[PDB]
């Protein structure tokens with residue numbers, strides 16, 4: 001019983017591994033940042049460039065997930081994925097600098113730690129939900 | 142009423158998962174794979190002579 | 192005849208399938224493609240963890 | 243029940259996508275957009291192949307037109323090979339089914355029985371004014 | 381390092397391609413008869429055990445080539461020659477061309493093998509359902525092993541020619 005919704009769930013299953021790897025790298029980069037002459041600077045600009053270039057794909061791919069679900073008519077899952085898209089739309093993010101960070105070695109580091117851990121938990125839970133949905137739609141044949 | 146036909150109901154006859162391979166027999170696909178490996182190795186060998 | 196039919200009248204209304212290729216004919220190539228992307232993403236992480 | 247004998251209609255626009263069902267077309271679109279993004283991610287784990295250039299490569303490979311560049315890594319090459327196989331099968335399927343459409347034509351009656359005629363209600367059905375065939379329905 | 385791997389590959393491939401042709405479990409078909417390349421044998425019938433040969437009578441060329449199963453025989457010969465050439469490279473070393481000769485023998489073996497199976501499968505069909513045994517898959521595994529040891533032999537030759 002192959003169906004468009006089934007294929008979209010399968011494709012999301014493939015992409016969610018990359019979506020997880022991004023947040024794992026973000027966690028490692030934060031842990032490298034927290035434990036700290038110009039060498040420390042060059043380290044902090046390297047990490048800032050890494051984060052700035054890694055932010056956008058993590059948002060665009062989730063945009064694909066929500067778009068695929070909207071266009072495939074799966075609303076119970078699009079409802080799950082809407083709040084994260086809204087947070088990814090810089091709703092809580094202020095307007096200070098284009099990048100996430102000025103070393104900003106302060107409570108901002110703890111906030112980014114907490115939100116990164118939360119994002120990883122959400123990603124893995126959503127991954128397992130996608131796997132279950134795919135198996136349910138296919139095996140039901 | 143009247144005398145009427147009676148035939149077995151035609152099943153849905155769902156296609157196989159890998160039904161796209163039918164237009165060519167199993168032997169043709171596997172010999173395609175094996176000729177691919179053979180051609181790759183021969184092209185490599187001929188390319189390299191020192 | 193009908194109102195007590197054991198087989199019932201499921202899909203009693205005429206249903207004529209179209210002659211277009213349905214997704215059930217070519218589902219195999221979609222399974223292959225999604226599997227290929229999954230394998231590519233396994234190899235592309237093994238290489239990076241190697242370095 | 244009397245209806246006009248069904249003849250072939252005037253072929254509407256957007257008929258070129260009849261040989262493949264709508265679900266297949268949607269799956270093709272999203273498979274292309276999935277393959278391109280995966281090829282991008284692969285080429286940016288370990289070659290240019292940014293998103294804008296990877297989308298062009300995938301679209302070029304689907305339309306059978308020669309690719310400008312080719313992946314060099316292994317994981318970038320598995321994706322290329324799989325998408326090549328997929329596009330070959332899909333184009334062969336489209337051409338073959340279109341040939342079937344053009345070769346032998348099947349005409350289907352829009353309406354089969356009176357129950358479906360009541361359900362449809364898109365076609366207007368009328369009796370004679372006054373008579374048994376009219377007074378029966380009252 | 382790699383010469384030993386080429387030797388073990390050469391003799392394993394020769395062993396598999398001389399077990400493939402001699403034994404008779406190629407094709408399973410109908411009572412169920414586990415066929416072979418030379419001899420057909422019966423199973424689950426009035427007769428069992430002992431068994432009889434095949435009868436093979438310009439399609440005559442196909443019949444004679446399938447009958448006198450030359451191409452697998454030649455594949456076995458070529459694999460053996462490649463094995464002895466790799467053996468003779470260790471002694472009388474620095475010949476620089478015996479190893480390339482081995483690299484060509486181990487590839488001509490693959491080509492003769494694939495002709496052998498194309499001919500066998502083409503003649504076989506000359507409805508009923510059939511299946512393939514383990515002699516067939518020893519042949520198929522010998523082909524793969526032959527091609528791989530061929531590429532390893534050329535790799536060794538190139539490395540040893542660049543070292544000079």
Ligand SMILES: O=c1[nH]c2cc(C(F)(F)F)c(N3CCOCC3)cc2n(CP(=O)(O)O)c1=O
Pocket residue numbers: 372373374375
């Ligand atoms: O006894 C009757 N016998 C009838 C026989 C016929 C027919 F068989 F067709 F000749 C018809 N027609 C129906 C349409 O085609 C032309 C005329 C009407 C009949 N009517 C009138 P009703 O009551 O309106 O059916 C009668 O009364």
Ligand SMILES: Oc1nc2ccc(-c3c(Cl)cccc3OC(F)(F)F)cc2[nH]1
Pocket residue numbers: 167168169170171172175400452493494496497498501516517518519520521523
């Ligand atoms: O001597 C031999 N050469 C061979 C080449 C291929 C095969 C084979 C295998 Cl290994 C698996 C499935 C089908 C096969 O035959 C095919 F032609 F491909 F259909 C067997 C062979 N034996």
Ligand SMILES: CCCCCCCCCCCC
Pocket residue numbers: 398401402418453456457
């Ligand atoms: C009926 C004749 C039997 C011939 C079989 C001899 C071939 C065995 C393998 C030879 C390879 C060296």
Ligand SMILES: CCCCCCCCCC
Pocket residue numbers: 162167170171173174177
């Ligand atoms: C019957 C399954 C084997 C088909 C293999 C198709 C791959 C051919 C491309 C090299």
Ligand SMILES: CCCCCCCC
Pocket residue numbers: 178182527528531532535
């Ligand atoms: C360098 C060894 C070759 C391994 C793969 C070759 C397959 C024909």
